[PDB]
Amino acid sequence: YPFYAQYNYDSPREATGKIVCANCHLAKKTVEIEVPQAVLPDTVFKAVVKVPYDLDIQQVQADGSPSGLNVGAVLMLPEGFKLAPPERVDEELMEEVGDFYYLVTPYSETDENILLAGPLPGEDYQEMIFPILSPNPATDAGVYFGKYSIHLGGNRGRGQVYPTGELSNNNAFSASIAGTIAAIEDNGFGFDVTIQPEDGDAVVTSILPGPELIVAVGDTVEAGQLLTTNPNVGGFGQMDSEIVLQSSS
Amino acid sequence: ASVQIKMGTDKYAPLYEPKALSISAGDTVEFVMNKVGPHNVIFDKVPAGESAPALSNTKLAIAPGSFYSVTLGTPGTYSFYCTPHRGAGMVGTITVE
Ligand code: HEC
Ligand SMILES: [Cu+2]
């Protein structure tokens, strides 16, 4: 969740440019963002975000059952940019934009330029439109007119790892050791895949409900080999765009 | 008496509040979403009497307001946790004395 990013990382964007959500959400999927070519100083404009996935496909949920996907994103605007205040949004636009206040949360108090949204139901939000208010360089020394980059990180679907560091049910599970599979037990969970190693020992690998077992009893497996498929339906993607902070007249 | 379970603290901290809850056989335990959602009810396990591993609702209520309420009776201490906010440290308890 975006919340998890906030606890883990003060800065959501790595030097490489990789967005932190990637640490948890392993798979890559597209992210799209559209903004105007240029905007006048203290003006409000819309940033349109889309996170595509096939609505027909269901994801493994916490209980192990299938369900819909939720989406969320981090939108990093240039310094001085912030989500627009309701008062600032012009009349035609207000209906067009996401509920300006409610959907959007700042990354941190200092971080108002970095906007977080979600999780939201994927079916509901095909497009997430952020009302954005540009800064005014005349008033603000910190910012100047020029071309700036906006970075988007957008995710759909449950992540692979927890801030605990432990893997979620929406991930591949691998054989802890090489050997033959004596047996497997099941409440959705394979409480255990029992593997008989090369020299008499027997080990048990527990997999949570959700992933689907690739292997069958009596099958030999190498260490680290995949016990299950990769159930992950979703993914996280990033895209950059540029906007010109223009001078009036 | 009728109680409620809030999911999340004003400190943008995803945790079950009150961390601890006590009630009597026949009381009810509501559940509302504070913030840092979504959330859901994913009990841990309860002693003979109730069915912790049943009430668990994976219906992640995105819409913030007030998930739902449920009445209990089986005496003992019930434990649960947040499926998502599992590592964030969002666990609580419920007693039915
Ligand atoms: C510490 C790892 C971690 C980080 C960091 C993290 N997430 Fe997640 N996220 C997860 C896991 C695991 C889940 C699944 C929780 C569950 O349902 O059990 C999740 C779920 C979500 C969901 C709900 C998806 C669904 O279909 O239910 C969204 C949306 C989301 N994360 C977005 C993001 C975004 C955007 C970022 C980065 C700004 C982010 N997450 C950072 C681990 C993380
Ligand atoms: Cu929670």
Angle, vertex CA B42, rays to CA B41 and CA B48, nearest 5: 110
| Distance of residue A23 Cα from the nearest chain B Cα, in angstroms | 15
Burial A42-79 (b: 16+ CB within 10 A, else e): bbbbbbebbbbbeeeeebbbbbbeeebbbbbbbbbbbe
**DSSP string for residues in A89-150:** S-HHHHTTS--HHHH-EESSSTTTTEEEEEEEETTT-S-EEEEEE---TTT-TT--SEEEEE
Residue closest via CA to ligand 1's atom 12 equals A159
How far apart CA A219 and CA A52 sit, in angstroms, is 38
How far apart CA B71 and CA A16 sit, in angstroms, is 52
CA dihedral A140, A145, A146, A147 (to 10 degrees): 70
| Distance of residue A172 Cα from the nearest chain B Cα, in angstroms | 18
Among residues A71, A56, A97, A48, the alpha carbon closest in space to that of A2 is found at A71
Helix (H, G, I), strand (E, B) or coil at A170: coil
* Known binding-site residue numbers of B for Cu cation: 39, 82, 85, 90
Does the C-beta of A235 come closer than 6 Å to ligand 1?
Answer: no
- Record: contact B84-A62, CB cut-off 8 A: yes
- Record: contact B58-A120, CB cut-off 8 A: no
Q: Is B42 on the interface with A (CB under 8 A)?
A: yes
Domain boundaries, chain A: 1-172+230-248, 173-229
Residues A180 and A163: beta-carbon distance below 8 Å: no
Residues B15 and B88: beta-carbon distance below 8 Å: yes
Which ligand is the nearest neighbour of the Cα of B39? 2
A1 assigned ligand-binding residue:
yes
Burial A135-163 (b: 16+ CB within 10 A, else e): bbbeeeeebebeebebbbbbbbbbbbbbb
**DSSP string for residues in chain B:** --EEEEEEETTTEEEEESSEEEE-TT-EEEEEE-SS----BEEEE--TTS-HHHH-B-----S-S--EEEE--S-SEEEEE-SSTTTTT-EEEEEE-
User: What's the CATH code, domain B1-97?
Assistant: 2.60.40.420
| Distance of residue B1 Cα from the nearest chain A Cα, in angstroms | 30
Does the C-beta of A157 come closer than 6 Å to ligand 1?
Answer: yes
Q: Which of B81, B85, B90 to mutate to test the interface with A (most CBs of A within 10 A)?
A: B85
C-alpha atoms less than 13 angstroms from C-alpha of A236 in its C-beta half-sphere: 19
Q: Do domains A1-172+230-248 and A173-229 have the same CATH topology?
A: no
Instruction: Quickly name the fold that domain A173-229 has.
Output: OB fold (Dihydrolipoamide Acetyltransferase, E2P) (2.40.50)
CATH class of A1-172+230-248: mainly beta
Does the C-beta of A117 come closer than 6 Å to ligand 1?
Answer: no
Does the C-beta of A162 come closer than 6 Å to ligand 1?
Answer: yes
